[PDB]
Design a protein around this nucleic acid. Structure first.
Ligand SMILES: [Mg+2]
Ligand SMILES: [Mg+2]
Ligand SMILES: [Mg+2]
Ligand SMILES: [Mg+2]
Ligand SMILES: [Mg+2]
Ligand SMILES: [Mg+2]
Ligand SMILES: [Mg+2]
Ligand SMILES: [Mg+2]
Ligand SMILES: [Mg+2]
Ligand SMILES: [Mg+2]
Ligand SMILES: [Mg+2]
Ligand SMILES: [Mg+2]
Ligand SMILES: [Mg+2]
Ligand SMILES: [Mg+2]
Ligand SMILES: [Mg+2]
Ligand SMILES: [Mg+2]
Ligand SMILES: [Mg+2]
Ligand SMILES: [Mg+2]
Ligand SMILES: [Mg+2]
Ligand SMILES: [Mg+2]
Ligand SMILES: [Mg+2]
Ligand SMILES: [Mg+2]
Ligand SMILES: [Mg+2]
Ligand SMILES: [Mg+2]
Ligand SMILES: [Mg+2]
Ligand SMILES: [Mg+2]
Ligand SMILES: [Mg+2]
Ligand SMILES: [Mg+2]
Ligand SMILES: [Mg+2]
Ligand SMILES: [Mg+2]
Ligand SMILES: [Mg+2]
Ligand SMILES: [Mg+2]
Ligand SMILES: [Mg+2]
Ligand SMILES: [Mg+2]
Ligand SMILES: [Mg+2]
Ligand SMILES: [Mg+2]
Lengths: 94, 80, 136, 58, 116
RNA sequence: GUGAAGAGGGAAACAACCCAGACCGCCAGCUAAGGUCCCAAAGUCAUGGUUAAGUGGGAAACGAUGUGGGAAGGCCCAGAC
RNA sequence: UCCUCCUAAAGAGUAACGGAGGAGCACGAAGGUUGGCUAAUCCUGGUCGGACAUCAGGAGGUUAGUGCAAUGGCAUAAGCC
RNA sequence: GCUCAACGGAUAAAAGGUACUCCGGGGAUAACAGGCUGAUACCGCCCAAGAGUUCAUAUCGACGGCGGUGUUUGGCACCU
RNA sequence: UGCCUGGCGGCCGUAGCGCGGUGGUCCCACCUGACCCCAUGCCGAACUCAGAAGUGAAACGCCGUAGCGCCGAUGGUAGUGUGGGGUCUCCCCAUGCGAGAGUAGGGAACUGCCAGGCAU
């Protein structure tokens, strides 16, 4: 089981996403179902450790945003081209 | 000393293109497009020349539009 | 030495080598040698690094080569002035962007692939790194 | 009447011709020249275009 | 197949009348019946129509798909067109040969008063 | 875009770089780039860190228990190294 | 000297002893119009007849064709009778 | 009626030599040398397949890679 | 008004293919015949004419079906205008624009005029 803590992005775009990855974070999005897509932000080192397991990309994950748990699955991940880092993750609502 | 070439040539630029754009009021007979083929096609009140030149048969504003099943580009003169 | 058999044209512009790469993930095999730097390689550098890892695995396992040198590089001869046509095609390169997986390998352990890709990377001008097959 | 103060704070020597025309449209002439213009979107667009070398005072 | 080749055979003069702005008479021909309709230059609505499927025309006839039926149709559509004030049209053969029942129809419409 | 056809201040000196466009005069003031120990105008300013190489104040592949910070890990008072 | 493409930086235009190719004609029908038609290639079967003549069906759907270079066009065919 | 094709066509009609040479000019343009550069050259270094009885690194060092100097052959044509 | 069908359009693949099913009162289609109108570089195949015995087999139309085709966000990424910066063959920062591909998902078209048939 993986429990991830997230925060709703106050601002979006290229400059913001570069600036989060400056401040050791990275954006993600939760989508799927009838609910609207949710633009979140994660801590990079936690999720980078959690993703080393295939359990991460197989099991159902709990994302806590505003104290609201969301069971999702890792649909797709954008990785850094030559560094062991994460750019962005798509989460599908289970 | 030595060398040569075989690739020195090129031809003159024929100044094709779109001479009057959309929403641009023209007189009758005004050349809209010069072109080789029918990259565009003649719509309403627009004639096609010998060299596939698109000219206005009437006066009014140019309307670019895509019609037909093949999504071909037609040029028409709206009335005004 | 890798080289296109036919080409539609004999010569090519110098171009540029900006942008990020596309062959980023380890597609086929298990271990990969990923380019970090930027530049152009050649068929000689490719074949030398292939030899160094084929010998380092003692032809055990399977090696993919993801790149192919398709860009011809011309040079003018010595004591020839700067005019009078484009120079003659001398060798072939592959433009390498950061992130390009250059080689892949499987059927061997990880440590053997490390020492093989290190022996190969000593023949290559660009700075490389070692990567593994990521799930997703 | 929703009018603002615009003050040229940098020089216009090596700047683009389009920026020089924008400063002429604002009526700015020299540095430190404080001018008083109405607040329209067209004015705000010129200020957006030369925001590096003016200082708008609301 | 045959339907498609008839359409290909017709779609040149149809597009030509489309750019001519011509009010157009459309003939359609079957082995049993023959159809006619006068179409506005927008091509989206009709003005008059006649056929051998109508009872008022078909009951006066022997067989619906002969030349005598085709002349009675072109006469009826001409009398309806002149009733509605439509006089000058352009005949669209709709990929048929101008021959036989089609020619007898257009000759009947010319004789009744249409102008093409 | 500048020079050419454009001076001034700065980059030691340095047409073309940075700031900035010289009507004239003044033993007045504010600033730009760039700077503030002395040559040489102005902070030996403040606070918190890093560097020990005169690095700063010239250079690569590569090499190395230099050193600072961070996240994780596997052995361990059932006694680790 | 002329034509076509790239260079040419999504209007036009744009240079080099830059990269690649052509033209210095032909046609009294290879023009006009009306009417009609629709390719390449492959598969199977079939007398001489064979990888490949002609014939019949099917796949395919313009990968063909355009008097000649290339580019852009072309099914309403500008292609073919 | 012109391959006036040197194709905006100097004339209807035209090839060469000069170390016997001369004038006007040019560092707008070459040779010498300087300068920039450093492909080449030279000097180093990296990896280490191998050779060296065994043994990569005593001595060499394939395939390939990174630099330095300004020293050759050259490039440009900034001074004269 | 409902259903079905034919014709002419609009639109131009969420509209197309495929697979399965289904239709014949009318319509349509095949279909019968051809001395004639007309036709075949031979051939009533086609074109055409005179018809209506048969069949919906084919074709067409309709219904269904996600094997495709097609459409397609959100977020991010690439790029880039201006300004600024660096270790300057390439990148970064502020700001503005913002893809393509891909993902979720959608999706087995919609609509107008006239006419006819059967029901109502
Ligand atoms: Mg930006
Ligand atoms: Mg000056
Ligand atoms: Mg100065
Ligand atoms: Mg200096
Ligand atoms: Mg000075
Ligand atoms: Mg300052
Ligand atoms: Mg002082
Ligand atoms: Mg102090
Ligand atoms: Mg252009
Ligand atoms: Mg442009
Ligand atoms: Mg022809
Ligand atoms: Mg025709
Ligand atoms: Mg055969
Ligand atoms: Mg001449
Ligand atoms: Mg000339
Ligand atoms: Mg002598
Ligand atoms: Mg002299
Ligand atoms: Mg000179
Ligand atoms: Mg010499
Ligand atoms: Mg010299
Ligand atoms: Mg040097
Ligand atoms: Mg060298
Ligand atoms: Mg030994
Ligand atoms: Mg050694
Ligand atoms: Mg060697
Ligand atoms: Mg020297
Ligand atoms: Mg030299
Ligand atoms: Mg020069
Ligand atoms: Mg000198
Ligand atoms: Mg079916
Ligand atoms: Mg028949
Ligand atoms: Mg059936
Ligand atoms: Mg987007
Ligand atoms: Mg998109
Ligand atoms: Mg569909
Ligand atoms: Mg269907």
């Amino acid at each position: 089981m993986f429990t991830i803590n997230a925060e709703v992005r106050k601002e979006q775009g290229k400059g913001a996403s570069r600036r989060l990855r400056a401040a050791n974070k990275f954006p993600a999005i939760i989508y799927g179902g009838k609910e609207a897509p949710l633009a979140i932000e994660l801590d990079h080192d936690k999720v980078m450790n959690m993703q080393a397991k295939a359990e991460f990309y197989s099991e159902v994950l709990t994302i806590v945003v505003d104290g609201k748990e969301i069971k999702v699955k890792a649909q797709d991940v954008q990785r850094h081209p030559y560094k062991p880092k994460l750019q962005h993750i798509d989460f599908v609502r289970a | 000393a030595g060398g040569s070439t075989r690739n020195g040539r090129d031809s003159e630029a024929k100044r094709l293109g779109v001479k009057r754009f959309g929403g641009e009021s023209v007189l009758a007979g005004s050349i809209i497009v010069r072109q080789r083929g029918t990259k565009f096609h003649a719509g309403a009140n627009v004639g096609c020349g010998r060299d596939h030149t698109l000219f206005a048969k009437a006066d009014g504003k140019v309307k670019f539009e895509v019609k037909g099943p093949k999504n071909r580009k037609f040029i028409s003169i709206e009335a005004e | 030495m890798l080289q296109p058999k036919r080409t539609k044209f004999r010569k090519m512009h110098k171009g540029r080598n900006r942008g990020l790469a596309q062959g980023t993930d380890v597609s086929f095999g298990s271990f990969g040698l990923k380019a970090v730097g930027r530049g152009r390689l050649t068929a000689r550098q490719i074949e030398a690094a292939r030899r160094a890892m084929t010998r380092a695995v003692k032809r055990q396992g399977k090696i993919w080569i993801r790149v192919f040198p398709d860009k011809p590089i011309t040079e003018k001869p010595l004591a020839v002035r700067m005019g009078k046509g484009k120079g003659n095609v001398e060798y072939w390169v592959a433009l390498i962007q950061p992130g390009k997986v250059l080689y892949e390998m499987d059927g061997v352990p990880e440590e053997l692939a490390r020492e093989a890709f290190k022996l190969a990377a000593a023949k290559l001008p660009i700075k490389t790194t070692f990567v593994t097959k990521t799930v997703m | 009447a929703k009018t603002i103060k615009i003050t040229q704070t940098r020089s216009a020597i090596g700047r683009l011709p389009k920026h020089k025309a924008t400063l002429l449209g604002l009526g700015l002439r020299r540095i430190g020249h404080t001018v008083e213009r109405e607040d329209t979107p067209a004015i705000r667009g010129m200020i957006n275009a030369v925001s590096f070398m003016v200082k708008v005072e609301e | 197949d045959k339907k498609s080749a008839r359409i290909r055979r017709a779609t040149r003069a149809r597009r030509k009348l489309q750019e001519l702005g011509a009010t157009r008479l459309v003939v359609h021909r079957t082995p049993r019946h023959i159809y006619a309709q006068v179409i506005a230059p927008n091509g989206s609505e009709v003005l008059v129509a006649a056929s051998t499927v109508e009872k008022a025309i078909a009951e006066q006839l022997k067989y619906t798909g002969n030349k005598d039926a085709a002349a009675a149709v072109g006469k009826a559509v001409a009398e309806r067109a002149l009733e509605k004030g439509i006089k000058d049209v352009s005949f669209d053969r709709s990929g048929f040969q101008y021959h036989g029942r089609v020619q007898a129809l257009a000759d009947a419409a010319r004789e009744a008063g249409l102008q093409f």
